[PDB]
């Protein structure tokens, strides 16, 4: 399991309660117990922030739901408070997820007094934590596969939501980690890995090789587009580009290998050999170039066993001409994934703490 996940952004603790209570007793002049109800909700909301972003400890669904709930709560608050006009100043400080900084300028962090900044960074951590949960699923288990498929698509859609909204939501230029180009690439990586999970589910369920090949071919397209966005950039961690390049080639080889089984079933023995030769060449390229990052020894042996038997029998029995790769029909593509739209509420059983306001 060589899957890419994203580290969560860190933030400093903020007293969320104090500035909110001061600016509720001014629109609603009360003596307490009536608007003290809403004031208690602000204490709950400051507690919710500390729970959602204050202790990056575990990778279970309790932590994700807490982050999702905190995201829902924030989005539900910008309307009730006319924050387009300047009042209730609140600085959120977030560190870049990827840029370590140096010893000359400290870490890379940004402080902005804007709920758009906060909910962008919170949504980043929702997507990142979802990617970590997906990447740690047992993919030799149907429930692990299902969990990973759902979470990669969620992560893809949340990174994509950040891409489309982060610039208008902020008054400054964002840090690079949440900038449209970076989260656009993260979105496509999660989309690729979701497609890979569907391929692994089809393989595990022993679906028709025609379908497995189109699923792998689609995954190759996604991985290929992802690595092309990371060809000239060093934003993401070191291991992302070679893993993407390897997965692109591995998924093309899986497409060819499963298409070659279809060719054999149709008695197209020349074509089977041509496709196995292509798969072998791709896997040899991955083995020699990306060995530190993937383990293709078992897949290589499977291809070579198939190709040896294929050639032995074609030379001795069938004498099919082995077509050139250019003369083979393209393998189709089947996409089973989509970037999940972010439509608040994204957390379960959501109840807005400021609903009656």
């Amino acid at each position: 399991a060589t899957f890419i996940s994203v580290q969560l952004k860190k933030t400093s603790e903020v007293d969320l309660a104090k500035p909110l209570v001061k600016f509720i007793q001014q629109t609603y002049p009360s003596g307490g117990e009536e608007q003290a109800q809403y004031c208690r909700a602000a204490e709950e909301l400051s507690k919710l922030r500390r729970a959602a972003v204050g202790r990056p400890l575990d990778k279970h669904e309790g932590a994700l739901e807490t982050l999702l709930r905190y995201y829902d709560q924030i989005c539900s608050i910008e309307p009730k408070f006319p924050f387009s006009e300047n009042q209730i100043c609140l600085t959120f400080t977030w560190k870049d997820a990827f840029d370590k900084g140096s010893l000359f300028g400290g870490s890379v962090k940004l402080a902005l007094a804007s709920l758009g900044y906060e909910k962008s960074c919170v949504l980043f951590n929702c997507a990142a934590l979802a990617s970590q949960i997906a990447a740690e699923q047992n993919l030799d288990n149907d429930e692990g596969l299902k969990i990973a498929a759902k979470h990669y698509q969620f992560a893809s859609g949340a990174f994509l939501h950040i891409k489309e909204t982060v610039l208008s939501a902020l008054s400054r230029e964002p840090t690079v980690d949440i900038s449209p180009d970076t989260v656009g690439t993260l979105s496509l990586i999660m989309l690729a890995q979701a497609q890979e999970v569907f391929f692994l589910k089809a393989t595990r369920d022993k679906m028709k090789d025609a379908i497995i090949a189109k699923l792998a071919n689609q995954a190759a397209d996604y991985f290929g587009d992802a690595f092309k966005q990371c060809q000239y950039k060093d934003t993401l961690p070191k291991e992302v580009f070679p893993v993407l390049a390897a997965k692109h080639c591995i998924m093309q080889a899986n497409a060819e290998y499963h298409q070659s089984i279809l060719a054999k079933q149709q008695k197209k023995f020349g074509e089977e050999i041509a496709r196995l030769q292509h798969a072998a060449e791709l896997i040899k390229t991955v083995a020699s170039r990306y060995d530190e990052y993937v383990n293709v020894k078992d897949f290589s042996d499977k291809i070579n066993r198939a190709l040896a038997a294929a050639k032995k029998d074609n030379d001795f029995i069938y004498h099919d001409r082995v077509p050139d790769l250019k003369d083979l029909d393209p393998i189709g593509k089947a996409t089973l994934v989509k970037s999940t739209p972010v439509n608040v509420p994204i957390s379960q059983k959501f109840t807005d703490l400021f609903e009656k306001m």
């Binding site: 299902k146 498929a149 589910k201 679906m207 028709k208 025609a210 379908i211 089947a334 089973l336």
Partner: peptide
């Protein structure tokens, strides 16, 4: 082929 990916999709929900 068409129905086989229908089931795949349905499994994910």
């Amino acid at each position: 082929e068409d129905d086989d990916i229908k089931q795949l999709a349905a499994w994910a929900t």
